């Protein structure tokens, strides 16, 4: 049909589209690839959607205003990054997703392969074989975090990249430890920042943000309606850690878990199966 077209064997090709959509308000960039598989020997259309970009951690360190909170400081930080794709149109369904299972390794690298005749296959690795007519990979780093499939069904998929276990001066600390990232400040002139672990102790997913890399394939019966809408959501759930310096007992910490849930940037897209195009809606 148009522009970036890759012949992947006889009677088959892939038409490659992209969209880049950012939100300074939400601190997100969606850099999405949408690859149409056009195979005369497959009775369905298929769109491989690869979701990359950036989700800002939105980590911050602040004073707490008001009487009784003069030596109480606040750290907001992402307990989980949220990535999902949802549709409501009867004419479309999700037929695969990557990662498909929980993955706890620091690096995640997986491949979705396609072979003529409607045959998809996924592997929890990169560089396995030259047996596919077309392949797409995902690659991301999640130091101290784990990836879980929060929801998966024929119409939606949602992954959570969630805080798990961290390296600290005093050893390994669980993501559920209320004193995680808490330290005694050096001087009562200690700014809010000084009540919390320095940057060199905060892993990238806490200090900076996350660069997603996820795939799901949308399936559409050839001949059904020309278009489908779907939404891609990227965001975070933030926790708060409050640290109070008491006169004689020292540093005291309290965690507000799931303090800000679903702070997500949702973009609605339209796929046109007939023209092999993608548009951003709204």
């Amino acid at each position: 049909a148009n522009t970036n077209i890759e012949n992947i064997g006889d009677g088959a090709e892939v038409i490659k589209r992209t969209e880049d959509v950012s939100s300074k308000k939400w601190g997100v960039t969606q850099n999405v690839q949408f690859d149409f598989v056009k195979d005369k020997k497959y009775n369905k259309d298929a769109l491989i959607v690869k979701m990359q970009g950036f989700i800002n951690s939105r980590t911050s360190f602040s004073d707490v205003k008001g009487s009784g909170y003069e030596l109480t400081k606040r750290m907001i930080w992402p307990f989980q990054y949220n990535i999902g794709l949802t549709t409501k149109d009867p004419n479309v369904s999700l037929i695969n997703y990557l990662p498909k299972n929980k993955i706890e390794t620091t690096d995640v690298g997986q491949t979705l392969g396609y072979n003529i005749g409607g045959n998809f296959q996924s592997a929890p690795s990169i560089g396995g074989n030259g047996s596919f007519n077309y392949s797409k990979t995902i690659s991301y780093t999640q130091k101290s975090y784990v990836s879980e499939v929060d929801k998966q069904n024929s119409k939606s998929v949602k992954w959570g990249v969630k805080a798990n276990e961290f390296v600290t001066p005093d050893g390994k600390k669980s993501a559920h430890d209320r004193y995680l990232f808490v330290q005694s400040p050096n001087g009562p002139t200690g700014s809010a920042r000084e009540y919390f672990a320095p940057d060199n102790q905060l892993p990238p997913l806490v200090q900076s943000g996350f660069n997603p890399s996820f795939i799901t394939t949308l399936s559409h019966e050839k001949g059904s309606s020309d278009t489908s809408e779907f939404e891609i959501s990227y965001g975070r759930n933030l926790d708060i850690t409050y640290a109070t310096l008491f006169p004689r007992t020292g540093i005291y910490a309290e965690r507000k878990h799931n303090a800000f849930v679903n702070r997500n940037f949702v973009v609605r897209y339209e796929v046109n199966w007939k023209t092999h195009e993608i548009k951003v809606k709204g």
Binding site: S60, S62, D63, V64, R74, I76, F260
Partner: peptide, 5 residues
Amino acid sequence: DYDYG
């Protein structure tokens, strides 16, 4: 900053 900074 959630109106805290």
